[PDB]
Amino acid sequence: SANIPRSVWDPAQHNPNWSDSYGHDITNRRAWPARKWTVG
Amino acid sequence: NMNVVQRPCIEDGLLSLVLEAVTKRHPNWVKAGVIQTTLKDPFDALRWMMHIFIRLSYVPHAGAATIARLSRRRIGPIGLEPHQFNVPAELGFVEQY
Amino acid sequence: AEAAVTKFLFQRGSFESMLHRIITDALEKMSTLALGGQEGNLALEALKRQTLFKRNDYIQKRLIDVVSNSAYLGYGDSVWQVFFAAVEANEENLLSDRATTDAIRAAWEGVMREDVVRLPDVTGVVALYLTLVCIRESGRLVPEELKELSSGLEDGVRPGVRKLQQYPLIFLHPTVKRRFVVKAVAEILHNSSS
Amino acid sequence: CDPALTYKLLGDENGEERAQEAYRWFDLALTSLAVDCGHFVPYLPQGTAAASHITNALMRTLLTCGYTHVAAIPDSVYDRMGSMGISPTISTYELVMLALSLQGNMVEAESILSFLRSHHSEHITVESFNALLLGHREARQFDCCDAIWQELVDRRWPRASPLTAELYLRSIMDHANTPTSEPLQSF
Amino acid sequence: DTQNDKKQLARRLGRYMLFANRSLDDTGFPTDARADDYTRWMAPPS
Amino acid sequence: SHRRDYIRMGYIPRYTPWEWIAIQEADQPLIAEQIRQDNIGTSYFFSLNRYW
Amino acid sequence: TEFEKRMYDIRHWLHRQTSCEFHTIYRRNVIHDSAVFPTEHDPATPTTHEHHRMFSFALDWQSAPVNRLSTDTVHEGESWDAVAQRLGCSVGELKDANAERETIEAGVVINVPVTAT
Amino acid sequence: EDGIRGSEVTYKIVLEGFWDHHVMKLAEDVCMFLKDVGRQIVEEKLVAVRRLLQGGAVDPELLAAFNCARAGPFGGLDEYDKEEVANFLRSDLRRLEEQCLSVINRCNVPVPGATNI
Amino acid sequence: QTLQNNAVEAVGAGSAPWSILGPLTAIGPTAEDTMVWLQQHYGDVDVMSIMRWARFRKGKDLMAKDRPQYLARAAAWIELLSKRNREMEEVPLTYMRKSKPLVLDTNSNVRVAWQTPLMRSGGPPRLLAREEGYVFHHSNSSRFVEETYRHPGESLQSRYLALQPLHTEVSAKEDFQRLYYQAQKHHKQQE
Amino acid sequence: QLQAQDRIICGTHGAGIVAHQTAVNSSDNPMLSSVTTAAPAADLSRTKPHEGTGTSERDPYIRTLHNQRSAAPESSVSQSHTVNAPTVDECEMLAERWGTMNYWHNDTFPRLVVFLK
Amino acid sequence: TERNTIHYGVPIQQIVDEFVFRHRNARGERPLDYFKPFPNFRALRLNRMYRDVEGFSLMKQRPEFLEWELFTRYRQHHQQRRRLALLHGLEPVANETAQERDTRRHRLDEICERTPFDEREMRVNDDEMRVSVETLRSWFGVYMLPSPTVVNAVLGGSASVNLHLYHLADEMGTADTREHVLSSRYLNRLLLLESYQNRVGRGFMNHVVGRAPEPVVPHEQPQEVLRHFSAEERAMYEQHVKEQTSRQLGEWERAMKRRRWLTDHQQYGHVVSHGLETSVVDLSHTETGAVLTVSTKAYEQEIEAVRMKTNATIKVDGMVYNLLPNSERRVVPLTVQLDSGEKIDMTSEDFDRCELEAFPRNLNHALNYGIANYAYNRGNYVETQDSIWEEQTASGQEGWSPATHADGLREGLPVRARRPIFSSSAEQRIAGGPQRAVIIQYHHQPFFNPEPRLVKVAFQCDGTIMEVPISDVMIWQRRYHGPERTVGDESRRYNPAAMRRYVDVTDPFNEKT
């Protein structure tokens, strides 16, 4: 086959479910406020 | 009761007719002794059925090895003799560089 | 004409040239050696029609209508299921020492000894055959209740299947159900206390 | 020794005149056949094997000439064959495939192989896979050039020819010798 | 039909290449340059 | 290659880039014995007794 | 083969101070001949424990398979099926391994069909 | 066997570092790589297989190889016509497509938030 | 006899037109006519040398013992080694239809097939396929069709709703052999 | 499955998210203080295949679209287990055809009914 | 020759990465769901418009108040249509011709109409206000979200003035409140009314129906370029324009004469006069085998006496015919003119099989004027989505594929499972051809579902429950890639000012309500 797979560079084979590099690691380190409710 | 269906009734004149049509369709089956043209026994209908099913789904060892060679690229020699037998087998080994 | 309706059933062109032979010869021997009316030719053409129609009707009613309900046959699978079921009851007939050569028993057993037994594909006539055989077998294997009437071939063959039957009245029309309910609850509310 | 450049460089030898002569002799040939045939009276000569053979010859020649004629095989000649009523043979199709391929038109060539695969499969020779191979090598699609060799290895029939391996190997060296753009050329 | 006549002799010439899509440079000859660059050179004014 | 922050501003690829794989791969030769093709059969008699 | 190639190649771009092993397990046709490894009755003399002492492996035994002659000289008063009944095979077989020859004279060398008993 | 449990050829790569997270991250990298190379190869074999399934001839040689037995299961030398043999071939190729699709489909699951290898 | 077989298989069994006149010329009654005939029809191979090689089998001399076996052998070998004979011994194949994509799109897989003058008698005068915009297209999922749309009357459904696309399914090929044979069977019935 | 996927992802140079209509002219923003107004593009000029003179979208400063052949990935839909509508050319040859029991009795388009009819 | 230098451009991933780097996470282009706890991998990506919004013209570009919620409800209706479809086995077949497509869509429509909409699958993506059916109805009108009674009334009626705004009576004497699944033929019948055409922004349809498309002249010039043309050259330019326009409008005229080739009379012909639609039956001759055709309103008595098995044969003018088994159709008599100035009577059915003189690709253009040609009704949401469905089927992006663990198998999912066949004689197991079945339950946790994995499933055929190996199961894939290939891609509302958007940190999902 080709040395570098067609699925890498060809936009017809583009994978829409993929996400950008930065987004996930930004949403990952989020610590949400732990007082969601009164009393606890 | 609208969904319920009557179980049909099949007669040996019909079954023999069909069996003949099959006989003509695959001549070599009658030749090689897969099936016979005659319906004599009560159990021969089912019996010929099973013989068909076995001829179709059973693969002779030489044929199996060759076919597995074709599209799966299974490597090895393959004996075409009566006195040779093709054993499908696993080979493990290690590589280190 | 009778031998012709039955014998050539599964190749229609062959049957056709054969019928054409039969009545073209009956018509040669009709032209000379016959006499003062044309009725013989009309009865021979009507005999061509009658023969043809009896054949077409035979393959209609004794084949096509038996086969045509696919859901009944479980879309080809009931047909297979029944098969093994049959083979399971009758093993002292099909696979036994007295019954068959060890070569065949070994071929069978070797087919069944695979990790997944994949049901082999089949030619059209073989399909018709297999179906017919296993219908006629499902005759015997089933309970005495469903012998005549059931929904589906395979029905009852295996004793313990867990079905989804759980709604008795959902098949009925809403209007009837509704009127019934209003009436009945009107009465229970206007009648008792507990 | 590139079997493709053989055709292309052969088109420069008085290609046009040779073409015109192949056409002329062809019309001559149909005249002759119609004479020899004179029950399928309406269908003679065109319904005969001989006729087919002659058309095959015409095409096989037209491949040798200049671009215009190569490009006119799958276009004019084949349509005229259908029109006329002459039934093709495997060589007809492998010739048309070869024509389309030399043009660099893959979509159509592979469509043809697909047709042949579906209906007529038991007649397929290797020169078809040779056609497509050479073809992809022209259009410079080397992954399809790969795909077809791998497939032709799997089904071991029809047998590959030393020409086939010549084509695929050539394709490899071609791919191997091409540069990328500047972004990937740094290291 | 009749050998080497008008319609046959027309069909022999193949597909007609339009002068619209023809890429013709300064000297009236098909261009040396890549299709994108030519497309860009001859691109309409604004 | 186009990334000017590469080792300087702290960007270090987590996945080794395709180009680089292609190069490292292109540099070393492939052993011929690693292909593993046997169409003949095992040599029973001679093979183990071959020249010293 | 190509997958194996990329895979053996991953050792070249492997990470810093990291090494690797390759375990391959594939499927391969082996071939059992009843010709070279025939299925025969036990000898009419048995083998004792004695054939097995230490260094009996280096002395009292050959390395299998044993060498059977595929070539045989025809004795004088013989005919095709005298030779065939001698070699333990059908006449047809003997004729086919030897297909070259139409007749077998005394003192001639012949090809034993490998399925002979 | 179907799905995960079975294959023609199994490769095991054993990666070894001096530090744990080294080999872990390494495993992620090599794994992603073989996911893409894997998809590529298996895809190609899939298009080959699909073509093969659409139609094709049968070897004289394969046919011969089916017909070599003195006596097949029905107790006489059996005639496999080229039809039947093509039917076997076709069955197995259908199976191969199942397995190709299995692998390819698995390759496309591990997306960035969802990756578990 | 091969010509005969092919022409009979072409119809799926009478005789097709395919066997009426074949590519091989009748031999003149002479020795020189023979050598010449072999020369022009089979002459890419060297035939004399192949007839020499085919002489001996397993030490046995075939020419001086079995005539017909030697004959069938030299025949087979010249048959196999020549590309010319291979080209002329071929089987008639049906003729593939070119196609255009639909004017009203439903499937990409459903295409309008070109139709030869032979298959539709009647039909308006038409050009050749390529001039009309038909091309080679095929795949596993292909289906071919004759395309038209239902006639809208005068009603709301004509003016507002889109055109309704009536298809009539056709074969992807054209059997020239089967057609010719069938029509000459029609001429043997009429007469 | 984007809307107008080709006109945008495959056909447009930026995947739609680079705005090619932009002036490189000097800007008064604090962060844009490095920006120098550009000379107009070179008129008759031959670029490198990965670039452009930056005039338009049709001609970007950086060319993203590959110049090779584009082929959308091979479907992961089962070609085997799917059953299409019967064609004509299938119904002519129906007598020679080999199906699965699911193919003859298939719920939609059963072939057995056709074969008998 | 340009392919001599292989240019792999920058992959799309790299582009998106650079973009979202230059923007420091680009919060403008993110979905609001990205800013709430544990966003799923679909909320992790940018704001691209998907294909689901393509048939809804009610919301124009800025959707007004409640529009977006309405649309979301339509979208869910279509997802349920798809589920019903896979369920009873009528889905796009990659091969299918238009007649089979028509039959199929029809059966699907009936099964839709008779099934209650499911609200438990009604889900709310970020910022969307939850609303009941009833609110949507009383605001937008009931015709838009029809009760089965209104569906029935529109399919079984005629008149235009009735577009039913408010509810209808029911057999029980109540106002009918049910939400059944939307059905394409209904939406067609609504596209037939003028009021509706205007409501959905298609009002232009009234003016533009029979007219030509506006001529598009290749290389048309501005006045700014034309100012440099010489008098002669300008004359030439005019020559060009005139000839193009003339040609195109003439092409429209010729095409909309709507003429077809009559093979019998060897001529082109066209329709002068329409009769009403008659029900028609076919009568086959007994002796000759010839086939005739008969208006069922004329012979009604005799035909109905044959349907009662009393007299089994129908004589006409001395020739007796047998009634064909079904052959009961609706056909229109047509008065057709020939270019000889001739007149015939031909059925609609047979005049339909004919070949057209003109078939230009823009015939349906009038339906979207100036916007691209479509072969389907683009005012119908359901039919548009169905068209898309069929396209992506035929392309092979959509279809039956061996299931993965990640594809989101869950209760209620339509599935094709290979029916396990039970034999004692068999070690291991026996597999058989795929049949349609619903998932009853699927255990994800490795400890409820050991290897090899199982799925409890109910086969539609006999209504049977079984445990099936997951490697034996196929699902309907919406797209190539996954992880979840069973579920469709959902567009989100576009926000003009993205930087001002607010998340309540205490109840992000707005669960206190």
mmCIF file of N, CA and C in Angstrom, chain K residues 382-462:
data_model
loop_
_atom_site.group_PDB
_atom_site.id
_atom_site.type_symbol
_atom_site.label_atom_id
_atom_site.label_comp_id
_atom_site.label_asym_id
_atom_site.label_seq_id
_atom_site.Cartn_x
_atom_site.Cartn_y
_atom_site.Cartn_z
ATOM 1 N N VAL K 382 -40.260 15.778 5.917
ATOM 2 C CA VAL K 382 -40.167 14.332 5.915
ATOM 3 C C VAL K 382 -39.617 13.777 4.601
ATOM 4 N N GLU K 383 -40.098 14.282 3.478
ATOM 5 C CA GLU K 383 -39.651 13.752 2.204
ATOM 6 C C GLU K 383 -38.224 14.149 1.906
ATOM 7 N N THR K 384 -37.812 15.320 2.372
ATOM 8 C CA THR K 384 -36.430 15.752 2.171
ATOM 9 C C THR K 384 -35.469 14.855 2.927
ATOM 10 N N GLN K 385 -35.747 14.692 4.216
ATOM 11 C CA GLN K 385 -34.966 13.801 5.057
ATOM 12 C C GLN K 385 -34.953 12.381 4.511
ATOM 13 N N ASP K 386 -36.072 11.955 3.927
ATOM 14 C CA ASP K 386 -36.144 10.627 3.323
ATOM 15 C C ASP K 386 -35.244 10.545 2.087
ATOM 16 N N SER K 387 -35.236 11.604 1.286
ATOM 17 C CA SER K 387 -34.356 11.664 0.128
ATOM 18 C C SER K 387 -32.904 11.523 0.555
ATOM 19 N N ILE K 388 -32.532 12.252 1.605
ATOM 20 C CA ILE K 388 -31.163 12.227 2.119
ATOM 21 C C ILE K 388 -30.797 10.836 2.583
ATOM 22 N N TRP K 389 -31.723 10.246 3.319
ATOM 23 C CA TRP K 389 -31.606 8.880 3.768
ATOM 24 C C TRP K 389 -31.254 7.964 2.613
ATOM 25 N N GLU K 390 -32.050 8.036 1.560
ATOM 26 C CA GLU K 390 -31.849 7.162 0.418
ATOM 27 C C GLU K 390 -30.514 7.414 -0.299
ATOM 28 N N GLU K 391 -30.128 8.685 -0.417
ATOM 29 C CA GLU K 391 -28.833 9.047 -0.996
ATOM 30 C C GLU K 391 -27.689 8.407 -0.255
ATOM 31 N N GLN K 392 -27.630 8.669 1.048
ATOM 32 C CA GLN K 392 -26.535 8.180 1.890
ATOM 33 C C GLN K 392 -26.563 6.660 2.021
ATOM 34 N N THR K 393 -27.717 6.066 1.725
ATOM 35 C CA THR K 393 -27.814 4.617 1.592
ATOM 36 C C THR K 393 -27.108 4.130 0.343
ATOM 37 N N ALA K 394 -27.505 4.705 -0.788
ATOM 38 C CA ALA K 394 -26.963 4.320 -2.081
ATOM 39 C C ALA K 394 -25.454 4.571 -2.192
ATOM 40 N N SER K 395 -24.955 5.555 -1.448
ATOM 41 C CA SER K 395 -23.531 5.878 -1.474
ATOM 42 C C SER K 395 -22.749 4.913 -0.601
ATOM 43 N N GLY K 396 -23.455 4.243 0.297
ATOM 44 C CA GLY K 396 -22.816 3.322 1.210
ATOM 45 C C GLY K 396 -22.286 3.971 2.477
ATOM 46 N N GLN K 397 -22.784 5.160 2.803
ATOM 47 C CA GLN K 397 -22.477 5.740 4.094
ATOM 48 C C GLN K 397 -23.455 5.208 5.128
ATOM 49 N N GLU K 398 -24.561 4.634 4.658
ATOM 50 C CA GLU K 398 -25.639 4.200 5.542
ATOM 51 C C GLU K 398 -26.096 2.792 5.217
ATOM 52 N N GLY K 399 -26.106 1.916 6.216
ATOM 53 C CA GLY K 399 -26.479 0.537 5.922
ATOM 54 C C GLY K 399 -26.269 -0.492 7.014
ATOM 55 N N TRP K 400 -26.575 -1.759 6.733
ATOM 56 C CA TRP K 400 -26.477 -2.789 7.770
ATOM 57 C C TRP K 400 -25.037 -3.236 7.976
ATOM 58 N N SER K 401 -24.506 -3.018 9.174
ATOM 59 C CA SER K 401 -23.089 -3.276 9.415
ATOM 60 C C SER K 401 -22.898 -4.028 10.716
ATOM 61 N N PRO K 402 -21.892 -4.923 10.772
ATOM 62 C CA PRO K 402 -21.667 -5.682 12.008
ATOM 63 C C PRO K 402 -21.400 -4.751 13.179
ATOM 64 N N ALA K 403 -22.149 -4.946 14.258
ATOM 65 C CA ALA K 403 -22.188 -3.983 15.349
ATOM 66 C C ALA K 403 -20.918 -3.990 16.174
ATOM 67 N N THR K 404 -20.673 -2.856 16.817
ATOM 68 C CA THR K 404 -19.554 -2.708 17.711
ATOM 69 C C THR K 404 -20.128 -2.585 19.103
ATOM 70 N N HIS K 405 -19.275 -2.578 20.110
ATOM 71 C CA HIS K 405 -19.750 -2.475 21.471
ATOM 72 C C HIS K 405 -20.109 -1.013 21.742
ATOM 73 N N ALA K 406 -19.527 -0.121 20.947
ATOM 74 C CA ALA K 406 -19.578 1.302 21.233
ATOM 75 C C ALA K 406 -20.693 2.009 20.501
ATOM 76 N N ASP K 407 -21.449 1.264 19.707
ATOM 77 C CA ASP K 407 -22.393 1.876 18.783
ATOM 78 C C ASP K 407 -23.670 2.284 19.500
ATOM 79 N N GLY K 408 -23.700 2.061 20.811
ATOM 80 C CA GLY K 408 -24.829 2.482 21.617
ATOM 81 C C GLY K 408 -26.020 1.568 21.448
ATOM 82 N N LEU K 409 -25.772 0.272 21.577
ATOM 83 C CA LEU K 409 -26.856 -0.684 21.686
ATOM 84 C C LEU K 409 -27.607 -0.407 22.981
ATOM 85 N N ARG K 410 -28.925 -0.331 22.888
ATOM 86 C CA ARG K 410 -29.758 0.000 24.031
ATOM 87 C C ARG K 410 -31.148 -0.557 23.783
ATOM 88 N N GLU K 411 -31.974 -0.636 24.822
ATOM 89 C CA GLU K 411 -33.339 -1.122 24.649
ATOM 90 C C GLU K 411 -34.095 -0.289 23.617
ATOM 91 N N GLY K 412 -34.754 -0.973 22.685
ATOM 92 C CA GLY K 412 -35.586 -0.319 21.694
ATOM 93 C C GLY K 412 -34.911 -0.169 20.349
ATOM 94 N N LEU K 413 -33.687 -0.666 20.231
ATOM 95 C CA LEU K 413 -32.937 -0.497 18.995
ATOM 96 C C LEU K 413 -33.203 -1.617 18.003
ATOM 97 N N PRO K 414 -33.580 -1.240 16.778
ATOM 98 C CA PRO K 414 -33.776 -2.126 15.629
ATOM 99 C C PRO K 414 -32.461 -2.723 15.181
ATOM 100 N N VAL K 415 -32.452 -4.023 14.945
ATOM 101 C CA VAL K 415 -31.208 -4.749 14.777
ATOM 102 C C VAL K 415 -31.443 -5.948 13.877
ATOM 103 N N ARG K 416 -30.464 -6.337 13.069
ATOM 104 C CA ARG K 416 -30.597 -7.580 12.325
ATOM 105 C C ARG K 416 -29.645 -8.603 12.892
ATOM 106 N N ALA K 417 -30.199 -9.620 13.536
ATOM 107 C CA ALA K 417 -29.379 -10.603 14.231
ATOM 108 C C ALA K 417 -29.397 -11.934 13.512
ATOM 109 N N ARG K 418 -28.266 -12.624 13.521
ATOM 110 C CA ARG K 418 -28.209 -13.921 12.884
ATOM 111 C C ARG K 418 -28.849 -14.927 13.827
ATOM 112 N N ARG K 419 -29.969 -15.487 13.375
ATOM 113 C CA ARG K 419 -30.841 -16.326 14.192
ATOM 114 C C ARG K 419 -30.123 -17.587 14.658
ATOM 115 N N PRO K 420 -29.964 -17.744 15.976
ATOM 116 C CA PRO K 420 -29.339 -18.978 16.443
ATOM 117 C C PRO K 420 -30.226 -20.194 16.204
ATOM 118 N N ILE K 421 -29.618 -21.229 15.639
ATOM 119 C CA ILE K 421 -30.310 -22.460 15.306
ATOM 120 C C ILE K 421 -29.844 -23.591 16.218
ATOM 121 N N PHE K 422 -30.775 -24.195 16.955
ATOM 122 C CA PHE K 422 -30.416 -25.153 17.999
ATOM 123 C C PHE K 422 -30.426 -26.596 17.558
ATOM 124 N N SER K 423 -29.256 -27.209 17.654
ATOM 125 C CA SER K 423 -29.100 -28.626 17.391
ATOM 126 C C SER K 423 -28.246 -29.237 18.488
ATOM 127 N N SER K 424 -28.680 -30.378 19.007
ATOM 128 C CA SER K 424 -27.876 -31.120 19.960
ATOM 129 C C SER K 424 -26.642 -31.625 19.259
ATOM 130 N N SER K 425 -26.836 -32.039 18.011
ATOM 131 C CA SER K 425 -25.781 -32.668 17.231
ATOM 132 C C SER K 425 -24.554 -31.769 17.092
ATOM 133 N N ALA K 426 -24.747 -30.469 17.306
ATOM 134 C CA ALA K 426 -23.689 -29.485 17.090
ATOM 135 C C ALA K 426 -22.955 -29.107 18.354
ATOM 136 N N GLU K 427 -21.652 -29.362 18.367
ATOM 137 C CA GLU K 427 -20.781 -28.717 19.333
ATOM 138 C C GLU K 427 -20.731 -27.252 18.947
ATOM 139 N N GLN K 428 -20.318 -26.412 19.887
ATOM 140 C CA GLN K 428 -20.306 -24.972 19.668
ATOM 141 C C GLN K 428 -21.715 -24.474 19.378
ATOM 142 N N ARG K 429 -21.899 -23.810 18.244
ATOM 143 C CA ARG K 429 -23.212 -23.279 17.913
ATOM 144 C C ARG K 429 -23.445 -23.231 16.415
ATOM 145 N N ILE K 430 -24.704 -23.071 16.025
ATOM 146 C CA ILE K 430 -25.063 -22.923 14.623
ATOM 147 C C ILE K 430 -25.601 -21.519 14.377
ATOM 148 N N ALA K 431 -25.181 -20.914 13.275
ATOM 149 C CA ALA K 431 -25.637 -19.588 12.893
ATOM 150 C C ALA K 431 -26.544 -19.671 11.657
ATOM 151 N N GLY K 432 -27.431 -18.698 11.477
ATOM 152 C CA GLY K 432 -28.332 -18.691 10.335
ATOM 153 C C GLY K 432 -28.576 -17.275 9.850
ATOM 154 N N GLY K 433 -29.240 -17.131 8.702
ATOM 155 C CA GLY K 433 -29.417 -15.835 8.051
ATOM 156 C C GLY K 433 -30.001 -14.741 8.935
ATOM 157 N N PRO K 434 -29.586 -13.485 8.711
ATOM 158 C CA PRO K 434 -30.050 -12.347 9.519
ATOM 159 C C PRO K 434 -31.563 -12.127 9.492
ATOM 160 N N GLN K 435 -32.148 -11.903 10.662
ATOM 161 C CA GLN K 435 -33.552 -11.527 10.751
ATOM 162 C C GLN K 435 -33.738 -10.289 11.613
ATOM 163 N N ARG K 436 -34.819 -9.557 11.358
ATOM 164 C CA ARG K 436 -35.071 -8.307 12.059
ATOM 165 C C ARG K 436 -35.537 -8.578 13.482
ATOM 166 N N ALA K 437 -34.979 -7.833 14.434
ATOM 167 C CA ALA K 437 -35.235 -8.027 15.861
ATOM 168 C C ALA K 437 -34.965 -6.757 16.657
ATOM 169 N N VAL K 438 -35.605 -6.623 17.810
ATOM 170 C CA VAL K 438 -35.369 -5.452 18.647
ATOM 171 C C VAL K 438 -34.525 -5.830 19.850
ATOM 172 N N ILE K 439 -33.679 -4.921 20.330
ATOM 173 C CA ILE K 439 -32.920 -5.218 21.539
ATOM 174 C C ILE K 439 -33.811 -5.090 22.769
ATOM 175 N N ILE K 440 -33.920 -6.173 23.525
ATOM 176 C CA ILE K 440 -34.632 -6.133 24.791
ATOM 177 C C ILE K 440 -33.774 -5.551 25.923
ATOM 178 N N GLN K 441 -32.551 -6.053 26.087
ATOM 179 C CA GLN K 441 -31.607 -5.468 27.041
ATOM 180 C C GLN K 441 -30.163 -5.747 26.642
ATOM 181 N N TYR K 442 -29.273 -4.810 26.935
ATOM 182 C CA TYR K 442 -27.862 -5.036 26.685
ATOM 183 C C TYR K 442 -27.023 -4.556 27.853
ATOM 184 N N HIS K 443 -26.268 -5.476 28.441
ATOM 185 C CA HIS K 443 -25.435 -5.149 29.587
ATOM 186 C C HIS K 443 -24.019 -4.753 29.179
ATOM 187 N N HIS K 444 -23.649 -3.505 29.467
ATOM 188 C CA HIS K 444 -22.331 -2.974 29.113
ATOM 189 C C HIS K 444 -21.251 -3.471 30.039
ATOM 190 N N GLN K 445 -21.564 -3.428 31.321
ATOM 191 C CA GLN K 445 -20.626 -3.809 32.348
ATOM 192 C C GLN K 445 -20.095 -5.215 32.082
ATOM 193 N N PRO K 446 -18.772 -5.327 31.920
ATOM 194 C CA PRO K 446 -18.046 -6.560 31.630
ATOM 195 C C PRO K 446 -18.421 -7.708 32.553
ATOM 196 N N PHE K 447 -18.879 -7.390 33.756
ATOM 197 C CA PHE K 447 -19.235 -8.421 34.714
ATOM 198 C C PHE K 447 -20.693 -8.899 34.637
ATOM 199 N N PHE K 448 -21.573 -8.172 33.945
ATOM 200 C CA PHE K 448 -22.911 -8.709 33.646
ATOM 201 C C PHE K 448 -22.931 -9.418 32.304
ATOM 202 N N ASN K 449 -21.893 -9.179 31.513
ATOM 203 C CA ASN K 449 -21.856 -9.643 30.137
ATOM 204 C C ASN K 449 -20.457 -10.087 29.781
ATOM 205 N N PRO K 450 -20.074 -11.271 30.245
ATOM 206 C CA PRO K 450 -18.741 -11.835 30.029
ATOM 207 C C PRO K 450 -18.490 -12.177 28.564
ATOM 208 N N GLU K 451 -17.234 -12.416 28.194
ATOM 209 C CA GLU K 451 -16.902 -12.897 26.849
ATOM 210 C C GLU K 451 -17.292 -14.362 26.671
ATOM 211 N N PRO K 452 -17.844 -14.707 25.499
ATOM 212 C CA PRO K 452 -18.204 -13.747 24.454
ATOM 213 C C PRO K 452 -19.485 -13.004 24.810
ATOM 214 N N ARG K 453 -19.586 -11.742 24.402
ATOM 215 C CA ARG K 453 -20.721 -10.903 24.778
ATOM 216 C C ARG K 453 -22.047 -11.372 24.185
ATOM 217 N N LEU K 454 -23.133 -11.061 24.886
ATOM 218 C CA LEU K 454 -24.471 -11.458 24.466
ATOM 219 C C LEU K 454 -25.400 -10.266 24.402
ATOM 220 N N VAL K 455 -26.478 -10.415 23.651
ATOM 221 C CA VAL K 455 -27.523 -9.414 23.592
ATOM 222 C C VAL K 455 -28.864 -10.124 23.670
ATOM 223 N N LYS K 456 -29.701 -9.745 24.627
ATOM 224 C CA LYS K 456 -31.042 -10.312 24.688
ATOM 225 C C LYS K 456 -31.907 -9.587 23.683
ATOM 226 N N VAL K 457 -32.506 -10.335 22.772
ATOM 227 C CA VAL K 457 -33.157 -9.729 21.628
ATOM 228 C C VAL K 457 -34.476 -10.431 21.329
ATOM 229 N N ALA K 458 -35.440 -9.669 20.817
ATOM 230 C CA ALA K 458 -36.733 -10.215 20.420
ATOM 231 C C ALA K 458 -36.890 -10.184 18.905
ATOM 232 N N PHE K 459 -36.832 -11.368 18.294
ATOM 233 C CA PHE K 459 -37.047 -11.540 16.863
ATOM 234 C C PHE K 459 -38.473 -11.243 16.494
ATOM 235 N N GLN K 460 -38.603 -10.357 15.516
ATOM 236 C CA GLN K 460 -39.868 -9.802 15.068
ATOM 237 C C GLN K 460 -40.800 -10.840 14.489
ATOM 238 N N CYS K 461 -40.207 -11.836 13.840
ATOM 239 C CA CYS K 461 -40.957 -12.861 13.133
ATOM 240 C C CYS K 461 -41.988 -13.550 14.027
ATOM 241 N N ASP K 462 -41.503 -14.393 14.929
ATOM 242 C CA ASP K 462 -42.370 -15.174 15.801
ATOM 243 C C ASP K 462 -42.544 -14.517 17.165
#
